[PDB]
Design a protein. Structure first.
Lengths: 456, 460
């Protein structure tokens, strides 16, 4: 199926012919170098990569021959280390002789600290470290998604608290609508799973499948969604049957919440006449677990939320909570999924507070904004060789030498270099061996991942 | 392997309970809308059709898996088990939809229908909305192929003006985006899209995709060359950079070799090492295997200009027929840092002002070519435009299209998208859209050779 001998940058293929004689070790590391400032990042995703692509017998005679042919044509010359891959196949039954150490999945670590390290375990495979860089560095994506998601969660927790006095339901405040905005099916799954580290709402079940497959969970409902009615289905009934459309929907989905666009024809007539009275007997009767969620009209993200809230406020009973903020009845809520990114989320929620509107009233959705438009540059994700051993001599190639992560008694994180960690300075290394010679040596359930990524 | 019943936005799962009774048709379309990148390269649909939609994609096992997944996901039974079983029993699991599209590789101006989708069996009215997700992801290869072609245009302009021809244009932009994209699948798709316009890529997966889903007569559709970076050269120590260089050039002499030159000494490497010390091993390299020098970091233009100058003094520089400086055939430069469509223009412009032929330099694009792209760059939009209920028809950015769409060209060759089925009259040339998928079968397929031909630049 997938061939790891063909999963590296092409130029790295020739590295086994570029090192000095007797090079026995190449040690490399990944960090989110320093440079809404993302001060701390969530380390998430390496486990997926290790399990899906690196563990077990990943080298076969068949795969060796495939790579030899592919590369012969690619470089128009035989520059493929066939013998080197044959050694791995025969010596370790196709298992990769490398060791990867990393901070636990879900850990929140400030920028500029070692997150994981990679090195070969057999001197003959000094070239392997550079080779697997490509596959490992893609962990930047789930790290970045989990990080940007958590930052948005911090914004939501702050205002939810100040406006309601608590954080109940925080986990359902930001929904992942990024399926259609990402670059591939695989990316959709990875990204959705990274969002689920922080929240539970997603429209990409592939995220849940990845979690259950690569991490494991005891959580009864790790990821959820609610039926949603959009323009495409409502307008199919016609302007004269919008009421029938609305009644049909709410009656079809009465035991769970339901999202319905109010912008199909006229939000006023829809909220004031249809919802307001014509079908009122179907709304007020809904449980607090299955509220009607109104998806505001098109326009400015903040303005629209207020407008719809003010309208609804005029037709339904609003009350002030213990914190003194306007709160719609339990059977009625609002969702803003258009133009909501990390920066805009701020202004929106900010405006709501200043207008006496509680955050309990609204939830948000983000699409290609939280799964796409993100790059390695956001957190300055960097992978580099920091230590090499040639002719028995240890040399430093960014951070220098062998690295280790530590947390001081004051609760600060520090990455010690040049093997200084060996001096047992600041306790024990926080990086743990997760992969060694083809075997995943330490794994985490998704429950642990979420616990480690929890808000401070 | 893959369960298409689980590959749609969640909220679309319940649509089979949202339409009026006897809704028999749902017709939707895809376009790169314009406001108020003038042309896009349509590429990638065929990969999706063949990999995910064709053949028997529904099985009892998949239907059951979906039922369980959605029951937990929605906390209620809102999965159309009956509707999917119907496809399994009536069409042996083949999807009853028809997709029409402009040819793969075709160049179409913005604001025009590119592909359409509709159910072929009235009982499957709900299927059109369902597959939107998987089909709209074509926005990615479309965008990559389009952006890549725009850069090709810039390079073509300056290569022609500075050398007189476009020889070797296909090797001027190398794809180094493997490490900068979000996944393995995305790497392959993206690399394939770049290969629509160029041949250099460091992602062999892109070539695999081309051969598997398109096919080619080209004996070498994608290529790369050995390259030496800092992590490998610095391993030798500052005092052995010359040996590192010597070793590498000797190792790879029948093929071109890329070598970083800013490890330690930037001037000494070009002047002394490459010059006085190893010149004998460079001037001897054939024109098919030149030494490729990769410049230091910093401003991309300044660095390119500074490197050419240093070399241009230690090596014999000529003057082509257009009067621009040209390095000897065994020596070239590559700039793979900080290059995107905006920076590319500034660089080639700078070289022209400095009288340097574009022949001397090639470029590399990474994350800024396969990741710094979104659906909004080209305003990729998918929308329902026609619906039939009870046997009756129903219906910032430019307005959306309505009714049955068709693509044509005026006698002047101007592209026009006709709406409300007006295309039936064929006032202009018949519909340019072709049926590429129908009831589980891919009905029209393009070789990557046709794709590249359709995407060629306009000589004008």
């Amino acid at each position: 199926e997938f061939n790891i001998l063909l999963a590296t940058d092409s130029y790295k293929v020739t590295h086994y012919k570029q090192y000095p004689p007797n090079t026995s070790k190449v040690y490399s590391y990944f960090e989110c170098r320093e440079k809404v400032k993302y001060e701390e990042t969530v380390f998430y995703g390496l486990q997926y990569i290790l399990n899906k692509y690196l563990k077990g017998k990943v080298v076969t005679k068949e795969k060796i021959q495939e790579a030899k042919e592919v590369y012969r044509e690619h470089f128009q010359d035989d520059v493929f280390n066939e013998r080197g891959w044959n050694y791995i196949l025969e010596k370790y039954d196709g298992h990769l002789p490398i060791e990867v150490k990393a901070v636990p999945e879900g850990s929140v670590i400030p920028r500029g600290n070692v997150l994981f390290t990679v090195e070969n375990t057999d001197p003959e495979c000094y070239w392997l470290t550079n080779w697997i860089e490509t596959i490992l560095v893609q962990s930047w994506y789930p790290i970045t998604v989990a990080t940007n998601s958590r930052e948005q969660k911090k914004i939501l927790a702050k205002y939810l608290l100040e406006t309601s006095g608590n954080l109940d339901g925080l986990e359902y405040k930001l929904h992942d609508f990024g399926y259609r905005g990402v670059s591939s099916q695989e990316t959709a799954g990875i990204g959705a799973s990274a969002h689920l580290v922080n929240f539970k709402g997603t429209d990409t079940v592939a995220g849940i499948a990845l979690i259950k497959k690569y991490y494991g969970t005891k959580d009864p409902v790790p990821g959820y969604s609610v039926p949603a009615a959009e323009h495409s289905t409502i307008t199919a009934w016609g302007k004269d049957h919008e009421k029938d459309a609305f009644e049909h929907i709410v009656t079809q989905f009465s035991s769970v919440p339901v999202s319905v666009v109010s912008d199909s024809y006229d939000i006023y007539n829809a909220c004031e006449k249809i919802w307001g009275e014509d079908l009122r007997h179907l709304i007020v009767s809904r449980s607090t677990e299955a509220p009607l969620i109104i998806r505001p009209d098109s326009g400015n993200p903040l303005d629209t939320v207020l407008k719809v809230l003010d309208i609804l406020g005029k037709k339904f009973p609003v009350s002030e909570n213990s914190k003194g903020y306007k709160l719609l009845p339990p059977y009625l809520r609002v969702i803003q999924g258009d133009g909501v990114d990390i920066n805009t989320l701020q202004e929106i929620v900010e405006g709501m507070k200043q207008k006496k509107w509680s955050i309990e009233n609204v939830s948000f959705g983000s699409g290609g904004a939280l799964l796409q438009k993100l790059t390695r540059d956001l957190l300055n994700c960097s992978f580099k060789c920091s230590y090499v051993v040639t002719n028995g001599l240890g040399v430093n190639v960014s951070k220098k030498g062998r690295l280790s992560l530590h947390r001081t008694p004051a609760g600060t994180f520090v990455t010690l270099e040049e093997g200084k960690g060996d001096l047992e300075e600041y306790g024990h290394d926080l990086l743990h061996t997760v992969f060694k010679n083809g075997k995943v040596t330490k794994s985490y359930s998704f429950d642990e991942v979420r616990k480690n990524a929890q808000l401070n």
